[PDB]
Design a protein around this ligand. Structure first.
Ligand code: AZM
Ligand code: ZN
Length: 258
C-alpha cells in the first residue's frame, strides 16, 4: 500500500495512488455551527456493547487498533439516523505532533487536540466487514473530540496496554472492555455522509460527531506519540502524527440532533 503521513507519502500525495482522494464525499470536514440543520427525524443514539467482545490491541504502524469479535450482534449501535443496527468492530485514535492541534474534524474552524473513532459495520445488509467497507451505507463511525486539560482516568487501561505493542505488527490480548465508558455524558451529535480518513478512502461512512468533548492530558498524548512505526530490531521512528487535513464539503449538509 505504502502511504503515510510524512511529506513523501502524506495526505497531499494520496491522490496520486488513490483517485477517490479527490472525491465529493471525503472526510474529515469543518463543521460550521451556523450552517448546520436541525433534523427532527434524528433519534437518540443508543450503544449496547458487551465487554466480552473485546479481543486484541495491535500496532499497525501508522496507529494502533483495539479489535472486537464481530461474529454476533452482542455489541451494536442503533438510533441516530439509522434504521438498522451496526456491529462494533474497532476503536482507534488520531493525534498530531503538538498537543494542541491533532483532531481530524474541526468545529467553527477550531482544531482540537485529538479524536477517538469508534467504528461499526452494517451487519443487517452485508456479510462481512470486507464487503460492507466500500458500500455507501457500509460503515458508521462515532467521532469524539478530545481537548487537552485534565488527565482522563478512563483512558488508563488503553495506555497500560501500549507497552506490549511497541513496534509494528505486535499484538496483545485486550479483553473485558466496554468502550462506551469513553463517550461523553450527553450524546447530542452532528451527522454527515463522508469517508474513511485514510487509504483506501472509501466513501462508505456515516459520521456521528459528538457535540461534547472529553479531556486528556498532555502526558497521555505523549504516550501515543511514543509508539514506534518500525518493526522490532530496526531504528526507532515514532508515530508522530496521523491526522488528515479537512476536505471541502462539496455541498453536503451537516445535520444536528438538537
Ligand atoms: C475498516 C476500516 O474502518 N478502515 C478504516 N480506515 N479509516 C477509518 S476512519 N479513520 O475513518 O475510522 S476506518
Ligand atoms: Zn480514524
Amino acid at each position: 500500500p505504502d502511504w503515510g503521513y510524512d511529506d513523501k507519502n502524506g495526505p497531499e500525495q494520496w491522490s496520486k495512488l488513490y483517485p477517490i482522494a479527490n472525491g465529493n464525499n471525503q472526510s474529515p470536514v469543518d463543521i460550521k455551527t451556523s450552517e448546520t440543520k436541525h433534523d427532527t427525524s434524528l433519534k437518540p443514539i443508543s450503544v449496547s456493547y458487551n465487554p466480552a467482545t473485546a479481543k486484541e490491541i495491535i500496532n499497525v504502524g501508522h496507529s494502533f487498533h483495539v479489535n472486537f469479535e464481530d461474529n454476533d450482534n452482542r455489541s451494536v449501535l442503533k438510533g441516530g439516523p439509522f434504521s438498522d443496527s451496526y456491529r462494533l468492530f474497532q476503536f482507534h485514535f488520531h493525534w498530531g505532533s503538538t498537543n494542541e492541534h491533532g483532531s481530524e474534524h474541526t468545529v467553527d474552524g477550531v482544531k482540537y487536540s485529538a479524536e477517538l473513532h469508534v467504528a461499526h459495520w452494517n451487519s443487517a445488509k452485508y456479510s462481512s466487514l470486507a464487503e460492507a467497507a466500500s458500500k455507501a451505507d457500509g460503515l458508521a463511525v462515532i467521532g469524539v473530540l478530545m481537548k487537552v486539560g485534565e488527565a482522563n482516568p478512563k483512558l488508563q487501561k488503553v495506555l497500560d496496554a501500549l507497552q506490549a505493542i511497541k513496534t509494528k505488527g505486535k499484538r496483545a490480548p485486550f479483553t473485558n472492555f466496554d468502550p462506551s465508558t469513553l463517550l461523553p455524558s450527553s450524546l447530542d451529535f452532528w451527522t454527515y455522509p463522508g469517508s474513511l480518513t485514510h487509504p483506501p478512502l472509501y466513501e462508505s461512512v456515516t459520521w456521528i460527531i459528538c457535540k461534547e468533548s472529553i479531556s486528556v492530558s498532555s502526558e497521555q498524548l505523549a504516550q501515543f506519540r511514543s509508539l514506534l512505526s518500525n518493526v522490532e530490531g530496526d531504528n526507532a521512528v515514532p508515530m508522530q502524527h496521523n491526522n488528515r487535513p479537512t476536505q471541502p464539503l462539496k455541498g453536503r449538509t451537516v445535520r444536528a440532533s438538537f
